Amino acid sequence: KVDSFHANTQYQHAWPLLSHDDLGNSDQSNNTKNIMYSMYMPKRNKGTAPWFRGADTYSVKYCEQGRYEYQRYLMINRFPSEYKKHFLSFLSNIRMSSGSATIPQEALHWLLRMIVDNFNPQHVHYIAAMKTLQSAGELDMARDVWKIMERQQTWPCTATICAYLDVCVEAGEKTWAMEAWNRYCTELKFLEPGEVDPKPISRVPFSLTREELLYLPKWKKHFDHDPNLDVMDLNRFNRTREVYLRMAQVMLAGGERNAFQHFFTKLEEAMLNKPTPVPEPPNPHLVRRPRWAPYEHCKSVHHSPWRLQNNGRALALGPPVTIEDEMQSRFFSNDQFLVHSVKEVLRIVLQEHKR
Amino acid sequence: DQTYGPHKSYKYTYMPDPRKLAPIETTQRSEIVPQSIRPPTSYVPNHETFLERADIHRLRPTSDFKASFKDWNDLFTCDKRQLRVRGIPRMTRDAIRTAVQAFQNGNPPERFDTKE
Amino acid sequence: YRRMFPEMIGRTGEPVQQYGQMPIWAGPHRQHANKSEHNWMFAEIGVNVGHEALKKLELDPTNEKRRRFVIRQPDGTLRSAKMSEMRAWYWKEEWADFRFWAPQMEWGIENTPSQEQYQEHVPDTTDADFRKQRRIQSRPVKWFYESHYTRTGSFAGFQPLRFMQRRTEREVRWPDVINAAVQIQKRKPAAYIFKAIPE
Amino acid sequence: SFKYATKLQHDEMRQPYYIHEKRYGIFSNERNIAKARRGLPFITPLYTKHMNLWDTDT
Amino acid sequence: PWWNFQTEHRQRCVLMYGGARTKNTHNANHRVFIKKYKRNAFPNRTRHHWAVSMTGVLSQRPRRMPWPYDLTSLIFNQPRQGSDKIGYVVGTSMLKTAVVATNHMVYYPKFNQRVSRTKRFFAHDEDLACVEGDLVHIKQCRKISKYKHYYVFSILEPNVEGRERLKLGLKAVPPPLFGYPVSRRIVKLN
Amino acid sequence: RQIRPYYNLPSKSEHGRKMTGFLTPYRHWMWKQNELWRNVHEAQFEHLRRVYKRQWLESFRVNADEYIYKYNITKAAQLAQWECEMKEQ
Amino acid sequence: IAHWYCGHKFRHRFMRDKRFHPSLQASHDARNRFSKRRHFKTNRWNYQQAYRDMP
Amino acid sequence: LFFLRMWFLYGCCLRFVLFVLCYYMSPRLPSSGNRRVLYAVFYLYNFVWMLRCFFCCFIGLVMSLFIIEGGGFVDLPGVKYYTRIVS
Amino acid sequence: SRWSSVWPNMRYGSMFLSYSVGRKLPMKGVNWVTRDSNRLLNFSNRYSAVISDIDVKRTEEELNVALSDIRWNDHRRIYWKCSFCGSSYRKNVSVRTKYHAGCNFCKKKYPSEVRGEQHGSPPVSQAAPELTEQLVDNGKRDNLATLAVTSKFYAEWTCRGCGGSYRSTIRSRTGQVEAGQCTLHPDIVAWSAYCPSCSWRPNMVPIAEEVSRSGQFLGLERSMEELGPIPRRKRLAC
Amino acid sequence: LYKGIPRPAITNLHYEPAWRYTLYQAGAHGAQLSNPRSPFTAKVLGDELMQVRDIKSVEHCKAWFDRLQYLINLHYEAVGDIGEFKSRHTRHVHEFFVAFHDALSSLDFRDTYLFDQFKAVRPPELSDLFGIFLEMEANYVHEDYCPRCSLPYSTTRYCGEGDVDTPFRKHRGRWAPHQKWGREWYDVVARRAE
Amino acid sequence: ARAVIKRRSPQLWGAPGAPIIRMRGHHVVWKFQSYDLVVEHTHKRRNSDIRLLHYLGKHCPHPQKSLWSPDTPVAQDRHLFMLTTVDIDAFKYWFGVKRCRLSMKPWALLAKAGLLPPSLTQNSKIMPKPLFDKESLMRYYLANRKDEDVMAREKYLNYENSMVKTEEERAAERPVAPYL
RNA sequence: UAAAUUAUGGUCAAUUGUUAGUAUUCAUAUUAAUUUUUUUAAAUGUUUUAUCAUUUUAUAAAGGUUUAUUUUUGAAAGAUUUUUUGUAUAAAAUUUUAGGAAUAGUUAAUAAUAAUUUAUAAUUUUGAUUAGAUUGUUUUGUUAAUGCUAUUAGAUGGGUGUGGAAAAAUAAAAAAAAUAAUUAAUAUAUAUCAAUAAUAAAUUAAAUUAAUCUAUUAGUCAGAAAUGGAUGCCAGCCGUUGCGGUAAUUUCUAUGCUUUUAAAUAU
Ligand SMILES: [Mg+2]
Ligand SMILES: [Mg+2]
Ligand SMILES: [Mg+2]
Ligand SMILES: [Mg+2]
Ligand SMILES: [Mg+2]
Ligand SMILES: [Mg+2]
Ligand SMILES: [Mg+2]
Ligand SMILES: [Mg+2]
Ligand SMILES: [Mg+2]
Ligand SMILES: [Mg+2]
Ligand SMILES: [Mg+2]
Ligand SMILES: [Mg+2]
Ligand SMILES: [Mg+2]
Ligand SMILES: [Zn+2]
Ligand SMILES: [Zn+2]
Ligand SMILES: [Zn+2]
């Protein structure tokens, strides 16, 4: 390719004819026209007329084309193992790509690039992108994540709806929250005495009978991990009360009393008269898991003898900011969640006063 | 079976082109950035003192070519082609020219002698 | 034609504009550097650029993925490429159209210089070329006195059979004298005699 | 159909590079370029096959 | 420039305009065979080498190249070539190991036609479902032992007959009457 | 390299190198000066580094997204066509 | 045909090519293409009672 | 083209040889005379071969090594190699 | 040695090289005689100037070529002295008669080299007449005062400081260039005042001065004092 | 039909246009001013900045014209003697003019930006150009000089002697003696003027 | 980390090191010599292609006459030309995102192109290197220092996200009546 | 089981031997090469450091491999502090020899087992293992063309196991932790396997800077071109039928004469 006596890569794009000095035809002063045609230009074979590669040899119809319309739908499957490896990678890349060097908008970049690679952006990715972006306090890009998810026709699960409604509140745009509501969370119910529990996971997961395998067309057998398949079973834990709460917060945020009164009333009533839904265990792919380590080889708090260094085994510097000392919002009883909700509404009143 | 050699000698005319001989617009780089020479220091008084302190390598024996230089200005008027004219061997002569342009930069030939 | 098809003679073009320079923090210390001897052309390449197939889309002012050129004049400013320079960066292109007036065609009697046409040097005098069957020649500047619509283009697109052809071979193997039909030439004499020629 | 179209050293005769991205992901080879044993003789196999011939999908 | 004639050459260092920068490897060499052995004694039992040998693989004439267009790529979308194979189970003498015979395809572009070759694989089936003569689906996986990179993914067609034969205490299939070919004459009577 | 001048602290040893890098306070000061200058250079330099990083990321956002537009439309088209062919089938 | 592959005649080349021809390849019907005759009449005098575990 | 007459060129266009003998041999009828044959030696991969060739050359003051060149056919059967110059 | 075989460089000025046997051989066959229709000295009604440019002593010494033996089209390269700027060079008459081949200096005689006389700039005798005495005196000082003040001509001057001779450009001396050419170094005037060797000292004075004032030198100073209504575009930053 | 997999949701995107977006604008990545002549750019930059931007093209054009009329006023009367061995040649001006006209009209250099400048750059006396060239054809017919090469009859033996740009003397070619006035060249001049 | 160092071609920090942008060509008679801008690793092997990240372009160091453009009476344009093909997107990618290194001669090129400010090694030996002292600098800095938030906003727009959403496009993107 | 038009569209496939009854890709042809000719290489001393030490500097020696060669970030890149993540060693296909037989620290299960664990084990005629030759899957030449015919080079076991990775014992032409230097591309006379030079090979002169070079061959029956003189089945010619028997247009020699002018000749 490069740096050799025979090196092709350098002739592989067009260049105007060089006459600096005598190249053997005495090109400095010599009129090279016929020299150009018969000698210098490449020919089909020795002696044939010169082969013209110019812009006029190609047809007109190349410039009639829209962009990326030459692409055809590509089904690339890959081992199950590889899907795990890859979604994980994209998750940790969306979280942060570089140490202080991460720009918030890199989250967005990595989500998009995952689409461009013919992977399906699972729910975890959307939530992660959204929380990351909102946390960097960049609010338009978070909604942009949402719009991407809508365009892929991925049905947002309840969790995702929560996340996007958090972005809605912080942005204080009621308009977004209404469309989001109206489309996806409508039929969302609460849990009643007759209703049962976390619903069990009911999906089959996808296999093929030998006749399915042999007689079907190729696309019918193509399983990319696709959300909408597991949406039903992502929602098996009934996080609905959270959605109603966020929705109250938004209707208040955009300054409309009636709607807010509605949501908050429903929520209140159901919180008093209906059983507390069983909370979901920690999601393995968001919060991870505490792998086992001995803490023995460690920097031994007094390490530098000028100061107190914090250490992996114990925290010797004291807390930098006070933490509320309450479990994650979903573990609460129903009554407790009612209280929590009031505190939430107040917090939003405050936030709106500061905007 | 080819014992006979080529069937034709393909040759192209030379026909001078009116357009290639057209007068070229020219600048000299000494206009855009003017050339100048540094006056000798007390550290480096004359050209052989220079060649003495710029001699470090065994195989860049500068101080032996003192006679190929008549003076100061002749040293900094020299370049590599014209420096080869005078028959200084190779890596020696580039150590010399490197030294000169180095001294021209504000960095004098002050460097520990490696020979030992 | 001129009245009914006014847009076939291009009167409009992409104006040569100057680019704003990037600020140099080092100040005057480096302000000499980008000012030099020559002009510096920079044409861009990349996966999305340099394909003849797409050429016009790429030179289009309306397209924003449009291939970019820059030129640093010897004083150190920078300007967009003139359209000639832009086109220089694509494989040379032949425009000749045969429908109304004859385009000027290559490898003719008056076109081809000597060594290809005849295998000897033939003196070029502007008078009395017997070989070329011309009496005399006044040589005005080629396209000056003619109408401009009459200029069409140049067709180089064929094999010049007198000069060089494909699958070169001996016409007749015996006698040993004949070559491929491209080798026509007069006999070289017994050793050369030079007459002094001021006369 | 001729000799000139035998020479793949033109870029006009050769299936372009980016195809190998479209199959394996984008910027996927920059990984493979830093590999310990490379180019002697062998490099990580480079898949360029006109996308309408792909055995997998079509 | 490879398109220029022998006498048309001027510089050997560059391509003036474009085209391909080519190196002429000298194809016509009159390369020859050296005869180092008597025709009576050649130091090999099976095959004898009396002339220059053609040395490529896929450079090797007449060209036989990998064809990924057969039945297997027809039914499957494979993440990596050979990640899926359909075959017949031949023999289980090894616990949790099913040997599988499988066809793949070769293409001769000179004759424009295909051949099926055949190849054996060791498949790991935990739990010993397979009987000889089953039509199985087979996948590429974790390296399991020295030779087993495939595992039995699904039985397409079990051997109903063979299983019944097993239940009754007999072998799944009768053992082949003759073994491999021989160059000897075995005289064994009664 | 790291320049070791003649007036650096000489080491007297037959078992090793003749000159240790150690500095006359003058040389140290000088070094600080020249260094400051170069700092002035790399400031602009790596500034331009992060500028181009965001440039490239942004252009990627826009173009990649447009690509998803067009591509998804394609993919939807093909899927429609397929399920049609299966109704026909 | 380069003259140095296989024998000193031409026909030797095409005779080795026939071992590579597509429609000539070895299978369950056409076997032992390269030495048929070393294996011929090899079991005539080898008496093997065929296998029966079933009545 | 007869490719087996070149056996001792071993793929080379010309060969070097040391002189040993010169005898005479009578060509195939109807061509009579004495054709001069030179019996030569050369070595390749430390094997010493005796090459037997037609002598068409010009011998001056006594000399040892010749330059063997290739074919064509000659009156004398079995003669395949020819002489170019003598060194 | 080996490298002796290498062909020289032919810049854009030069025509056909004639470095190879094939390029020499057809011309080796042309024998010239001076027949009185060829003699340069007959044609002085036209070529008179070209006759007075010839170095008559030198040519007959080195080349052994008579001045009566010189054709008007003659191809042999003979020595000349420029009757304008007074520099010696070796060319052939042919090339001075067929096209104009001068002294290689007076090529750059006018400014711009492209548009020859198009200068509207006054001569040196006018704009900066004080330069005319600094010229090295060959006797041609009256002609070199006729040149453009903008002229790119390469002239040799006697240094003020050491009284030796160097060579620089007339416009490099003046500091004036024609509108639309390349601007020179803003300091070029002060820096061409003296020798390449003698110029360092005087120009290093103001620097030492500015590090004496503030104890700190940054070349910034001039640009800064350039700072002590500009139309600007709307920005998309908002 | 309904065997084998659920119908991919993205299929919907075909039937309902509601789902076709592009989140971002065309040049929103920083390329907005790419089009020099777009209304958008005319709005962002404002007029005086645009003038500042195209000044270089304007002075290109002015340059071509200034060269043209210098050459015209130099060679206008076609026969005089302007220099040492050099004399006036209409042909000089002619060929420059063709260079210019090729800058505009040719399809290899197509530099047409040059013509967008004419309503300003073009000199008021140079508006007649072929008229001036005709006048030159008149001056060109004087009898002391060769009809072909325009060199003086007295001081010059051949056509194109001592002219740098001459057509009538090529490299290894031969010298051509002067051609004389008479009906031939008289009607040549005629036809050129035509 | 080699036992016996390959002595002639040393490098910093082992192999393959950083991505670096180099200018390289096979050596030949000066008349035909071209160079290649190449993004590649720090430690090269026998052939430069084994580690080659990207191909940035051809560069020809022969001043050329412009015969492509019509011969132009404008003075400047008839200076000779120097021709270079830059691939600027792989440049901005490798340099910007991947954080490249740079040899000096490529740097000079990329400076003439307006991609980078001129290098460290380009010296008008006319001027000296500057002097410095902290309190004069400090006086100049106390004189001119912009406001905190103006500067923070600068650093925002330059390094982080540039394209932003003005009020109008928000108002244009928020859902209307039936879902509002 | 009907024709089609809103008319040359989607950008060039094109084959040149003077033979000798007839059958069969086979002498003398062209293109490509070797014969063939010093215009692109180069010389030794790698380098800092805290001093007998410690940091930086990872694929050109040979052996002959055809079911064969495969891999990470912990180094640097690399951005702020400390913990911080997972992804890898595996496979699939393509594999030569005119006349062809068995191969073996050996398969699979167990498991951080077993120089004597358990078992009806593994490779082979769908051509194995030894042995011969041979540097593997974008590189050439010929050609109108499915073909035929090239493609270098580069990974050769372990034994205080360092190192992110063994690639670690001359043979660079990769600036190697302060801007050594870029007015640079020049390197003298050495080598290895490359790198095609008779570059207007003969009449008007070189918009130079005048530097390297003094440059020739064949045929002379058939088929462009012959006369003397010898020689006499001899000497010799020979791409080929064949020639040489005192008259050889086929040998040798002398002279002329013939050519379509990078040479004849051999491979
Ligand atoms: Mg040849
Ligand atoms: Mg082919
Ligand atoms: Mg052979
Ligand atoms: Mg014979
Ligand atoms: Mg090795
Ligand atoms: Mg072997
Ligand atoms: Mg394999
Ligand atoms: Mg493997
Ligand atoms: Mg060992
Ligand atoms: Mg005849
Ligand atoms: Mg003979
Ligand atoms: Mg007699
Ligand atoms: Mg006779
Ligand atoms: Zn002069
Ligand atoms: Zn002085
Ligand atoms: Zn005349």
Could you please report the per-residue DSSP string of J98-167? Answer: HHHHHHHH-SSS---GGGGGHHHHS-SSSTTTHHHHHHHHHHTT-TTB-TTT--BTTT--BTTTT-TT-S
Instruction: Enter the resolution in angstroms.
Output: 3.4
* Closest residue in chain F to residue K114, using alpha carbons only: F48
Q: Do A54 and C57 touch (CB under 8 A)?
A: no
Nearest amino-acid residue to L133, taking CA and C1': E53
The 8-class DSSP code of residue C193 comes to: -
Which residue's structure tokens are 């000889």? E132
Burial state string for I173-185 with b = 16 or more CB within 10 A and e = fewer than 16: bbbbbbebbbebb
CA of H72 to the centre of ligand 4 (A): 8
Quote the distance between the C-alpha of residue E73 and its chain's center. Answer: 17
Q: For residue C57, list chain A residues with Cβ-Cβ distance below 8 A.
A: 63
The answer to whether the beta carbons of residues A237 and A281 sit under 8 Å apart is no
J178 assigned to a ligand binding site: yes
The 8-class DSSP code of residue C120 comes to: S
Distance CA A207, CA J5 (A): 9
Q: Which nucleotide is nearest to A50 (CA to C1')?
A: L12
E30 assigned to a ligand binding site: yes
At a CB cut-off of 8 Å and minimum separation 6, what does J156 contact? I46, J146, J162, J178
Distance CA G44, CA G36 (A): 15
At a CB cut-off of 8 Å and minimum separation 6, what does G4 contact? E30, E31, E32, E33, E51, E52
The 8-class DSSP code of residue I135 comes to: B
Distance CA C55, CA B37 (A): 52
C109: tokens are: 């009697």
Distance CA K106, CA K96 (A): 16
Chain B 2-21, residues with CB within 8 Å of chain F CB atoms: none
The answer to whether the beta carbons of residues K58 and A15 sit under 8 Å apart is yes
- Burial category of I119 from C-beta neighbours within 10 Å (exposed 0-12, middle 13-18, buried 19 and up): middle
A105: tokens are: 């908008």
Q: For residue K52, list chain D residues with Cβ-Cβ distance below 8 A.
A: 33
Distance CA E105, CA G22 (A): 11
User: Measuring CA to CA, which residue among A248, A328, A259 is closest to residue A287?
Assistant: A328
E80: tokens are: 């990596």
Cα-trace Rg, chain J: 30
Q: Do A210 and E156 touch (CB under 8 A)?
A: yes
Distance CA E84, CA E86 (A): 7
Distance CA J53, CA J32 (A): 16
- Burial category of B17 from C-beta neighbours within 10 Å (exposed 0-12, middle 13-18, buried 19 and up): middle
I166: which strand partners? I157
The answer to whether the beta carbons of residues H40 and H68 sit under 8 Å apart is yes
At a CB cut-off of 8 Å and minimum separation 6, what does E29 contact? H11
At a CB cut-off of 8 Å and minimum separation 6, what does B77 contact? B37, I196
Query: Which DSSP string corresponds to K81-147?
Result: EEEEEE-HHHHIIIIIIS--EE-HHHHHHHHHTTSS---SS---TTS------HHHHHHHHHHS---
In this complex, the residue of D2, D9, D25 whose CB is nearest that of residue A117 is: D25
Task: Specify the length of chain B in residues.
Answer: 116
Distance CA G40, CA J91 (A): 99
In the structure, how far is the CA atom of residue G6 from the C1' atom of nucleotide L195, in angstroms?
A: 35
The answer to whether the beta carbons of residues A103 and K161 sit under 8 Å apart is yes
| 3-class DSSP state of J57 | helix
Cα-trace Rg, chain E: 27
B98: which strand partners? none
CA of G7 to the centre of ligand 4 (A): 27
Q: Pairing state of beta strands E113-124 and E148-157?
A: parallel
J146 assigned to a ligand binding site: yes
- List phi, psi (to 5°) of J137: -60, -35
The bases of strand L with some atom under 7 A from any protein CB are: 9-19, 25-36, 38-53, 56-60, 66, 68-73, 75-102, 107-110, 119-134, 136-155, 162-190, 194-215, 219, 223-225, 233-244, 257-267
The answer to whether the beta carbons of residues K70 and C84 sit under 8 Å apart is yes
Which amino acid appears at position A310 of this protein? Answer: N
- List phi, psi (to 5°) of I169: -105, 140
- G3–chain H Cβ distance below 8 A for any pair: yes
E148: tokens are: 């087993």
**Contact residues, chain K to chain I, C-beta under 8 Å:** 29-31, 65, 73-76, 78-80, 126-128, 130-133, 136-137, 157, 162-164, 166
Q: Do C75 and I219 touch (CB under 8 A)?
A: no
The answer to whether the beta carbons of residues B111 and F6 sit under 8 Å apart is yes
The 8-class DSSP code of residue F19 comes to: B
Mutate to test the interface with I, among J75, J85, J165 (most CBs of I within 10 A): J85
Distance CA C160, CA A50 (A): 11
Distance CA K25, CA K48 (A): 10
The answer to whether the beta carbons of residues A123 and A111 sit under 8 Å apart is no
Distance CA H22, CA H48 (A): 19
Which amino acid appears at position A86 of this protein? Answer: H
Distance CA A1, CA D9 (A): 10
Distance CA J45, CA K26 (A): 47
Q: Pairing state of beta strands E97-108 and E113-124?
A: antiparallel
* Closest residue in chain K to residue J96, using alpha carbons only: K71
The answer to whether the beta carbons of residues H63 and H42 sit under 8 Å apart is no
Q: Pairing state of beta strands K20-24 and K101-102?
A: parallel
At I155, which helix (H) or strand (E)?
Answer: strand I154-158
F29: tokens are: 């000061």
Q: What is the CB-side half-sphere exposure of residue A270 using CA atoms within 13 A?
A: 19
C-beta atoms surrounding K78 within 10 Å: 23
Which residue's structure tokens are 């006697």? I158
User: Measuring CA to CA, which residue among K59, K62, K50 is closest to residue K22?
Assistant: K59
Q: For residue C9, list chain J residues with Cβ-Cβ distance below 8 A.
A: 105
User: Measuring CA to CA, which residue among A206, J20, A221, E78 is closest to residue F76?
Assistant: J20
Q: What is the CB-side half-sphere exposure of residue H11 using CA atoms within 13 A?
A: 12
Q: Do A103 and K68 touch (CB under 8 A)?
A: no
Output the CA torsion A77→A80→A85→A86 (10° steps).
Answer: 30
C27: tokens are: 């100040």
